[PDB]
Amino acid sequence: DIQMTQSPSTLSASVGDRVTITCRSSQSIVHSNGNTYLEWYQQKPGKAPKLLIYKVSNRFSGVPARFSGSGSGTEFTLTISSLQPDDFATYYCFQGSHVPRTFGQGTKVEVKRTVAAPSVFIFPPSDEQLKSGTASVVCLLNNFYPREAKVQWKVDNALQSGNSQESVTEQDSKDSTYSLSSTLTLSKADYEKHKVYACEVTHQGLSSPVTKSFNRG
Amino acid sequence: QVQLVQSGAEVKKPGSSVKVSCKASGYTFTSYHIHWVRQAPGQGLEWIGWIYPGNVNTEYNEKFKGKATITADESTNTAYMELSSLRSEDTAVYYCAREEITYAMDYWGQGTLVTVSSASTKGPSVFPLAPSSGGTAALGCLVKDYFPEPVTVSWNSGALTSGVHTFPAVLQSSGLYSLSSVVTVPSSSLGTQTYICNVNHKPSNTKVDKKVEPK
Amino acid sequence: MIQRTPKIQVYSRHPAENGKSNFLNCYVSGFHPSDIEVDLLKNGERIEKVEHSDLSFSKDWSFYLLYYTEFTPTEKDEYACRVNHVTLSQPKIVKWDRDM
Amino acid sequence: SLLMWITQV
Amino acid sequence: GSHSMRYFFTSVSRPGRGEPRFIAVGYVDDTQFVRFDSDAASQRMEPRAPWIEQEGPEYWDGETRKVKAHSQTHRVDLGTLRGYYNQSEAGSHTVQRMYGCDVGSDWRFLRGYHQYAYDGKDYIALKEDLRSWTAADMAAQTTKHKWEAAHVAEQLRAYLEGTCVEWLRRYLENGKETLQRTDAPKTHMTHHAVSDHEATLRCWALSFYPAEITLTWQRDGEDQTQDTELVETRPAGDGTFQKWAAVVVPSGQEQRYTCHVQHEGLPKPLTLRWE
């Protein structure tokens, strides 16, 4: 199979910016026809993709003029000139010159804004849930930027591993911030055994890591 | 004026098989290749195969040969993708797309989500996330142990929308899903307003309204 | 320039069989230019019930045509193709050979 | 189907 | 398998006699489906296959109109070319044009072509990439420049990569019952004694479509390809094709000779044994 690698993997730009995604093939994608069949696709989370560029440099019907493709052989380049708010999405390059046809890994184009530190909040388990014999502690990071953050759980100063799950919101459409929710899951037995629960948050916009903690009781 | 319309979402058990439909209109059905593509929750897009109606020629990506069967019915203007030997790695959204003489996929279907899990249908438990101990206060709801997706969460029936964050679900080791929903509010309002999250998991018609209050 | 004389082949649609209806073909090909006269002869005398294909050509630009008529072969009757073209000083005649 | 027009030589 | 759609145009000037002749035909693979004759009564594009009858009266008007514009351009081209080559208005000349496209087994575009000849010599042709021209001599170098300035190449790329393939795919469906068939060669083999020590062995292939076929004689497993009389493949007139290949052998040696038939209607090649 033909390896399609896009560069960069993520990219943060503002409206009016000119953006370049490059796509490299492990071998030449030239058909016996004498045509290179490299296409470019635009995808928004949850939606079906939209065709943008076919045969390397041709615009599909109805696509704006600020999109354009170029390149040849093993390097290909999508350029989005003077970016517009609708253009924030994930872009995939595609080949079709050889079997199998193969996509790239994607490139997410996100909004750029100033750093914002997360507002941190921790939640002890509900009395209602302790009756189910299971306890869940919830650590919340609210309205931060950029997306890169790290969450660590400590139960009685012991760092927990493999018993925790987190999730992130899509970039918010109005303030362009993220929010993350990390969940530490123990049995009721293990929870009654310890007093101090603490998640520690390390993020670009915090001078030193932040801890939010409670004492069971 | 080209249209590809795909069948609704499904949920299966390991070892069985599923058959997604793709109805075309607005063009001559039997003269353009129809592809099938999958996108696993992971990230990337991946190609399954294609079929040319009329001569019913089919070519598959070797990664799915032996797993997928693509067919077509000219009488209905409808293509079919049947995946067999279901494993958990076959959970994904499955797309059909038409191809235009230029080799490019120009018109896509909406997508069909397919979920392979051995779990059983179950409505979720709803617990408060009480505003414990800045200038603003934060509360929420943990919606845990449900299957399959999705759950829908509103707050005060729809009358509270500013500051709300309902997170994507995650898949626990139990095979059940869990997501949380938080909203930031004023600190002062913690003794003037009532805060009620409205959960609705429709694969079991669970409708829970949980009041969250300080403690 | 170059002018190409036509190649003549004279045969039946089906393998020949006395008393059973068939079709007599004269396939002239490989010629240039396109002006050509072709006659089908039953015992030296031309047949008026002759149809032909439309003019087409091959990759080297040489033309080709199929002249054909219905007939019933017998043992005493002899058939042939009379072909005239600017590359021949005299109409060439090709006789129908049953095993060919 | 034929070309819509052929250009003169 | 592969498929092709091709249009052929023939223009002969007839000085003193009237309009030049204009004949045009269209083929899918080896099957002809339309014809136009500038001498016929109708003055229309006419069907030549049962499946092209499915097309409506909008088809027949549009194609009739297109073929007449094609005629008119050749009518002018005969004069122009006569001046380019400085020829008397008394001699008769022929202009031929061929163009079309190919698709492979997936019915995807493979190649297109547009070729133009004057008095049976290559005159100008579109190159493989569909963007450049091959000019034979000085007269063509002028038509080359003129056609580069007018972007005639780009009009053709549009047709040969798009419209052509769109239509070929449409015709292959409407004619699926016959265009997508393969009729396997019915074969047999004759022995005709020429001399006292020599004999003529002939290998026959009948009623086969498509016309592409291979007939070879072998002796002890060896292609005897300098001693064989192979005739140009010939239409049988009912849509199928005929071919034969013969060799002249020393008598007593017939069992050394074998006949080999390769056709796309044959799952495995044939070998017809003398025994």
Which residues on adjacent β-strands are paired with residue A184? A137, A164
In this structure, the strands spanning B46-52 and B18-25 are unpaired
> Which chain A residue lies closest to E103 (C-alpha atoms)?
A33
Q: Which residues of B touch A179 (CB under 8 A)?
A: 165, 167, 182
Q: How far is C24 from chain E (nearest CA, A)?
A: 10
Query: Exposed/middle/buried for E154, CB within 10 Å: 0-12, 13-18, 19+?
Result: exposed
Contacts 24+ apart (CB under 8 A), E136-142: E139/E81, E139/E84, E139/E85, E142/E84
Copy the structure tokens of residue B166: 């309902």
Q: How far apart are CA B87 and CA A40, in angstroms?
A: 31
* HSE-up (13 A, CA, CB side) for residue B201: 22
Cβ atoms A43, A107 nearer than 8 A = no
For residue B24, the surrounding DSSP H or E stretch is strand B18-25
Cβ pairs A/B, distance under 8 A: 126
d(CA C33, CA C63): 8
Contact call for residues E165 and B101 (beta carbons, < 8 A):
yes
**Residues B175/B145, Cβ–Cβ less than 8 Å:** no
Q: Which of A33, A35, A58 would best serve as a mutation to test chain E binding (most E beta carbons within 10 A)?
A: A33
| Residue keyed to tokens 């919830």 | A138
C-beta of residue E186 within 8 angstroms of C-beta of residue E207: yes
For strand A149-155 and strand A196-203, is the pairing parallel, antiparallel, or unpaired?
antiparallel
Burial of C26 (0-12, 13-18, 19+ CB in 10 A): buried
E173 closest CB neighbour out of B31, B33, B102 = B31
Q: Is E89 annotated as a binding residue?
A: no
Q: Which residue of chain A is at minimal alpha-carbon distance from E102?
A: A33
A–E interface: beta-carbon pairs under 8 A: 6
**d(C-alpha B131, C-alpha A92), whole Å:** 42
The pair of structure tokens assigned to B95 is: 């797309």
CA B192 to CA E113: how far, in whole Å?
Answer: 81
Provide the angle, in degrees to the nearest 10, between the axes of the packed helices E57-84 and E138-149. Answer: 130
* CB-CB contact of A23 with A104 (8 Å): yes
- Interface membership of E235 toward C (CB under 8 Å): yes
Distance between CA atoms of residues B83 and B71, nearest Å = 12
CATH superfamily of B125-212: Immunoglobulins (2.60.40.10)
E107 close to A (CB below 8 A): no
Sequence-ordered list of residues with C-beta below 8 angstroms from that of A102, at least 6 positions apart, any chain: A1, A2, A3, A4, A94, A95, B47
Overall domain count for chain C:
1
Distance CA A18, CA A170 (A): 23
Q: Is the peptide bond before A45 cis (omega within 30 degrees of 0)?
A: no
Other C-beta atoms closer than 10 Å to the C-beta of E33 total 22
- Sequence ranges of the domains in chain B: 3-116, 125-212
Among B5, B45, B62, the strongest candidate for a mutation testing the A interface, having the largest count of A CBs within 10 A, is: B45
Enter the tokens of residue B169. 């679900």
Instruction: Identify the domain containing residue C82 by its residue range.
Output: 1-100
Question: Are A and E close enough to touch, i.e. 3+ CB pairs under 8 angstroms?
Answer: yes
Rounded CA separation C100/E244 (Å)? 8
Task: Test B102 with E161 for CB contact under 8 angstroms.
Answer: yes
The residues that bridge with A155 in the sheet, in sequence order, are A158, A197
* One-letter amino acid of B33: H
CA–CA min distance E180, chain C (Å)? 23
Query: How many Å from the N-terminal Cα to the C-terminal Cα in chain A?
Result: 59
Collapse the DSSP code of E176 into the 3-class scheme (helix H, G, I; strand E, B; otherwise coil) and give the result. Answer: helix
Half-sphere exposure at residue E167, Cβ-oriented, CA atoms within 13 angstroms: 23
Residues A214/A197, Cβ–Cβ less than 8 Å? yes
CA distances from B204 to B113, B123, B166, E90, E185 (A): 18, 5, 20, 92, 65
Instruction: Name the residue type at position B192.
Output: T
Q: Residue E139: closest CA among chain D residues belongs to which residue?
A: D9
Give the pair of three-digit tokens for residue A79: 């350029």
Please check whether the two domains, B3-116 and B125-212, share a CATH topology. yes
- Euclidean distance between CA atoms E115 and E127, whole angstroms: 9
B103 interaction partners in chain E (CB closer than 8 Å) = 108
- Kindly tell me whether chain C and chain E come into contact, counting contact as 3+ Cβ pairs under 8 Å: yes
Does the annotation list E53 as a binding residue? no
Q: Do B140 and A50 touch (CB under 8 A)?
A: no
Residue B202 CA, chain-centre distance (Å), reads 13
E105: closest CA of chain C, how far (Å):
23
Provide the experimental method for this PDB entry: X-ray
For residues E155, E157, E162 and E163, what is the CA-based torsion angle, rounded to 10 degrees?
40
User: Best of A121, A132, A139 to disrupt the B interface by mutation (most B CBs within 10 Å)?
Assistant: A121
Contact E169 B31 (CB under 8 A): yes
CATH architecture of B3-116: Sandwich (2.60)
User: Diameter of chain B by CA atoms?
Assistant: 71
Sheet holding E94-103, edge to edge: E46-47, E31-37, E21-28, E3-12, E94-103, E109-118, E121-126, E133-135
Chains B and C lie in contact, requiring 3 or more CB pairs less than 8 Å apart: no
The one-letter amino acid code at E188 reads H
Tell me how far apart the alpha carbons of residues B96 and B111 are, in angstroms, rounded to a whole number.
7
3-state secondary structure E37-83: ECCCCCCCCEECCHHHHHCCHHHHHHHHHHHHHHHHHHHHHHHHHHH
Contact A36, A50 (CB under 8 A): no
Spell out the domains of chain A, with CATH numbers in brackets: 4-111 (2.60.40.10), 119-215 (2.60.40.10)
CA dist., res. A115 & res. A146, Å (int):
6
Q: Which domains are present in chain E?
A: 3-180 (3.30.500.10), 186-273 (2.60.40.10)
Q: How far apart are CA E142 and CA E136, in angstroms?
A: 11
Three-state SS annotation for B117-130: CCCCCECCEEEEEC
